Design a protein around this ligand. Structure first.
Ligand SMILES: CC(=O)CC(=O)SCCNC(=O)CCNC(=O)[C@H](O)C(C)(C)COP(=O)(O)OP(=O)(O)OC[C@H]1O[C@@H](n2cnc3c(N)ncnc32)[C@H](O)[C@@H]1OP(=O)(O)O
Ligand SMILES: CC(=O)CC(=O)SCCNC(=O)CCNC(=O)[C@H](O)C(C)(C)COP(=O)(O)OP(=O)(O)OC[C@H]1O[C@@H](n2cnc3c(N)ncnc32)[C@H](O)[C@@H]1OP(=O)(O)O
Lengths: 390, 390, 390, 390
């Protein structure tokens, strides 16, 4: 069983309280699903199921994955469900949809992730009531999306654990965060984000606004701007607003069918899916996931690391990214070539569906036979997926 | 591939704000995880991945699937995620774990669902700031759990729609409710729930308490007690609190491995998952969900409906319950043999693993060979699984 | 000018989240206004102004004093206002009422206080908009009621400051606390709170409840009960939940008019206001306020301490009550004869009027000619009033 | 007994979330207390009591009046309290101050009001808990300040009710509004608010800002810009954002003492308090309050309406201001000569002292012998004060 990605589409990544400040995630998910179908000329009524990862659904209504699907006119017959591997959420959904087809329980899947971090509420358990005293209204975005459940600290503190263990400096992490801005701003001028991006219409009261640009890419980054920042996590630390990724909005997807099914419908696929994998690492050093998780995908497929021609390794942080870059020892010239999540941004639940899209469209453009996407996960996991263009 | 349910367990079901009014889901989760590990004779350190369905995770923190696994003594090298097909979730995860093994990506999965509706917070988007005027604190249990996202009313109003369609009188709905309470009260006194129930110790400042008994079952439910209430959703309707299920907290799971992997180890499985299916219908009549699902399941197993010896079909509402039974035509004596959710309760994400456990253990207890699990789903779906005893 | 208290009344004092847990303060106030009218034989039409002290009106709506008056049927042509000198309020309002009549601006005043500490809300300033992370919902009872504005600590910490300066042992404070409970119980049992209490009907869906007993008074309070408690404010402190007053709900009032006005109407008044005073003291030892205030009241009356026949000195804390009695040196057997606030409760803005009602109705029953009510006040003040029988 | 206002002062009136956006009301009051002292040449040590009207003190901590007085160096031996008669507050506190001196209980009183509508929190009663279903976080500014407690509608609705009863057109309201702005602008440019205003230093982190101008006053207000607004309260209405006052922050105060005392000190007082009055009306038409209150004040003074040389009548709403002027029939050319609240702003509990400050300083400037200040009050009341020059 060979399961292909016939099409792929992603919204631009927005900035926290930015383009998509008041846009429910499922609206963004609605546009990517319509966009994969439109691109593959498959009608929404041919879609068996919609699998969207999502970390931050509080307030958004029953099963926002279904809410996306219905708004893109996937009929009532089809099915939709969410899931959560935090930041591996959006790429694991592609694996799960891939698995729906190899097991012969669905014919055509649309799988990705969606994320409105801007729209995440504050919350508090108030059923028993609060007999007396102050309490905290909690930011679900931070609590459910960015804080470890086991130690109680921010994910910036787990990338910092990788900065002392691998001895990565404050200079070296500025040289990756600037080099991801530089690579990404080049990309954006060059139009290389055009193909993958499907524009989204933010419906306003005094005028619509079509968003087709990733707005968290700061233009023309020097080094002295990065190296004059103040650590956001430790107070004698090395991770900062500039070498860590952002908080973002965004949705992203891929359209799945068997390889036989694409070629019947006259569809030249972006890739085949050849393997994946998911492993666990010490939570304290959660950024290291992409290492064992790339290894096991690369073993399953039957590929080495030197084989690879193109790689996305989500830059949740600059500490974690460099560490996965070092241990695996692959050519860093082919890694995050149109930049990564520092510059682009990091919409948690969508982000793995993002870097899958960037790789598949850049793989097409440049002529790379073998790609790899990978994402470190909070709690200490890694996830990966080896691709092969036809 | 031929996967088998080696072991299974669940907590008792808690009343709304009752025994587990302050117990986080993942705590209830860890207890059921430890349970199936110990019941199969597999050590936590052999588990590859934990899949928990869960509908209402806001405030609990990062990926409660990982929190339940790590607490239960599963080692950091394994992985963990959750998902949301609403009331279908807890059975869906078992099917999702079956595909990991079938696809050659996991040896051994723990799969089920967990839900604390007690612990679901209220919430509000408060980033913009509220310059003036009231804003709503939104009950996430009601918003994300029980409210249709397209039609804007409760699930119980969809039960009015199904009742109106199927011409199911109030007197009929109350007679299904009282039976389901009478079956469950009978099964409680007779220890038919003891096997599957694993006690949960609620730790407290002032005394540990062991919960080993479903507390939502009302003893000696009479036809008058059901017939004295008012309609809860429609002011000239039929659906009341007596003939719908409640708001509850619990968890439930199953350790899945290939059939061969069980034999090596001397485990006597509680079932082979022969076939599974999920179908979509109109959100207005979401209770009809089980109908196309149970029929597609049966088609995938190559079974006729008259081949089943046992059925658990989830009792969200006595209106939809009566109707699903009416269509499929199976003997109602082999349906919810030990009562259903009206009596036992309806902890949403957990329900699908809840009824599966119930089916598995009565399937063992009476020597039934063929069994089917099914659940209706908000926003217009159903899910279903055949189990066959070894 | 010679001003009399023609009539007085109070609700029973409710326990925190007890009998009045969901009764707005103005509803309690409305019953006492109606009662002082009924007791004097004065019609609501004849009232000029209602003045009600109240510390925690947040969320009750515009000017709760006007709500209470309107509810009691005081005509729209009268006026009403609220005021806040913390625990002084309910007494200070009476003096303020006296001054309307003494300056010829009113003939007929209803004055006192009202408080629902149970109904006091949690709050936060949210107009700016909170960009990110967690914020504090503030208990307005604690913040606006019980915390010193200059030093940041609870009123109980000022009770420790007084326990330290006056060298007041834990066992001395406990014996006082116990004696307060035992004298309150004896008075309650003997019917001594009957004349002052007007019953309050708590209107309830499933039945109305008449509350006519002070429910905070513990029956059979033992010295061992007090002795076993942990210090509530300082870990090597002496002040506990037992030897401090509680958090409580109630209202109390007095109907005033000139002595010649009472004479024409043939009313036998409860008392003439001979004098009153308010003084400040250091916030840190706020419980000492009654010292300077009572001395100043007595000076203004032309009375010696030895001339008093009965005293209500409010029992915020055993520590401060003991300091006060020690310094003034009045005969302790004439002070809080029927118990005090440790036993009865401390509904802040209402307590001044509460202990005036107690003073006035014991004065009448025992035939005492000369009386004095006094209270300490948060932020460092006291208030005192001298009453003589006609 | 003759009471004089020896001195007076006010902060500039701040725009809602404008200059004083994060300044607690007691900090504004502390600056005005300091200023009346300095302007009278009276030391803070000689103050007996501070009395500050305030409607919205939730979350500011214990008795903000005491907080203001202490910050101003008023010694701990003095006393301070707050009161609430809504927009009547800041004036009635002055009459209450007078009465303290008039009955021989104090020699020296600072009295007025302070309000921060910007700092007023949102709130909710959460003590019992919220077992299920949505609940509102209530804007305390709207709930406690601006909503009628009997009818449940905003004060702007009482204004409409007055517009309809007095048959006041939109065009007439708009005219009056534009006249208020144009007159306030003129008075501001010409320096007429300089004497009354004390500057307030907003303490910053990146620099202090000195505020000494009333920032709500729109410069170059056009009739067109009033006329184009949509009714704010009634969709076929008349009352708009433009012909209503605003939501504002500010404080104001007067230092009082006897006339014989000011003579001893050699103070030339701003005025003698000759009479005051407060009267109730129907809540539905509360804007009319000033009518019977001014009449009652004039009758107490022994004055005819035509004896007045200057008047401040608060402009809560153009509709009610116009009705007041119609029924009383005083020359509109002597009313709100420097504009009113539509232009200047309406910090509720501070406004009655705000307009007293404007009457007094204009009375001084023009040599006007007889004045009157009056306000309407939510819930159906009025307050008025007569002032004579010495
Ligand atoms: C503001 C002003 O201007 C004027 C003033 O006068 S300042 C005074 C204002 N009022 C105050 O400061 C209130 C003082 N009291 C308090 O703050 C609170 O009651 C407190 C903090 C001291 C207690 O906190 P709490 O969490 O509500 O505990 P609470 O339930 O009341 O009692 C604690 C325990 O002691 C027990 N207890 C209470 N009173 C007791 C007594 N008299 N004897 C024996 N046991 C007692 C209770 O049963 C409870 O036992 P359990 O936990 O096993 O059930
Ligand atoms: C409590 C008591 O006892 C006594 C009393 O007297 S009650 C009186 C107390 N106060 C009140 O009742 C408050 C009355 N006012 C309000 O509640 C509010 O200001 C209001 C509801 C009327 C308006 O509030 P809002 O929703 O924020 O609208 P707001 O932004 O202030 O104004 C809307 C428009 O009016 C316009 N506006 C107002 N005056 C204008 C003028 N002179 N020229 C041009 N435009 C003007 C603004 O330009 C604004 O346009 P934008 O949308 O482009 O910004």
């Amino acid at each position: 069983p060979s399961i292909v990605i016939a099409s792929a589409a992603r919204t631009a990544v927005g900035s926290f309280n930015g383009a998509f400040a008041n846009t429910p995630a499922h609206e963004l998910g609605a546009t990517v699903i319509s966009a994969v179908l439109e691109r593959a000329g498959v009608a929404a009524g041919e879609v068996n199921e919609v699998i969207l990862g999502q970390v931050l659904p509080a307030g958004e209504g029953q099963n926002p994955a279904r809410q996306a699907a219905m708004k893109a006119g996937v009929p009532q017959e089809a099915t939709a469900w969410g899931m959560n591997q935090l930041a591996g959420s959006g790429l694991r959904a592609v694996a799960l949809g891939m698995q729906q087809i190899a097991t012969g329980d669905a014919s055509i899947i649309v799988a990705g992730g969606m994320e409105s971090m801007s729209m995440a509420p504050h919350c508090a358990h108030l059923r028993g009531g609060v007999k007396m005293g102050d309490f905290k209204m909690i930011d679900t975005m931070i609590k459910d999306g960015l804080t470890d459940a086991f130690y109680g600290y921010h994910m910036g503190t787990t990338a910092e654990n990788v900065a002392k263990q691998w001895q990565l400096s404050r200079d070296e992490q500025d040289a990756f965060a600037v080099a991801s801005q530089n690579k990404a701003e080049a990309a954006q001028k060059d139009g290389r984000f055009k193909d993958e991006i499907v524009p989204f219409i933010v419906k306003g009261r005094k005028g619509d606004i079509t968003v087709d640009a990733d707005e968290y890419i700061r233009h023309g980054a020097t080094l002295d701007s990065m190296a004059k920042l103040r650590p956001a996590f430790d107070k004698e630390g090395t991770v900062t607003a500039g070498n860590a990724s952002g908080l973002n909005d965004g949705a992203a997807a891929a359209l799945l069918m068997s390889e036989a099914e694409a070629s019947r419908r006259g569809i030249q696929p972006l890739g085949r899916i050849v393997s994946w994998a998911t492993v666990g690492v010490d939570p304290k050093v959660m950024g290291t996931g992409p290492i064992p998780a790339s290894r096991k995908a690369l073993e399953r497929a039957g590929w080495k690391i030197g084989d690879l021609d193109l790689v996305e390794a989500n830059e949740a942080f600059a500490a974690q990214a460099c560490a996965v870059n070092k241990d695996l020892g692959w050519d860093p010239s082919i890694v995050n070539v149109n930049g990564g999540a520092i510059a682009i941004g990091h919409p948690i639940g969508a982000s793995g569906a993002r870097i899958l899209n960037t790789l598949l469209f850049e793989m097409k453009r440049r002529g790379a036979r073998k790609g790899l996407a990978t994402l470190c996960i909070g709690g200490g996991m890694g996830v990966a997926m080896c691709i092969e263009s036809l």
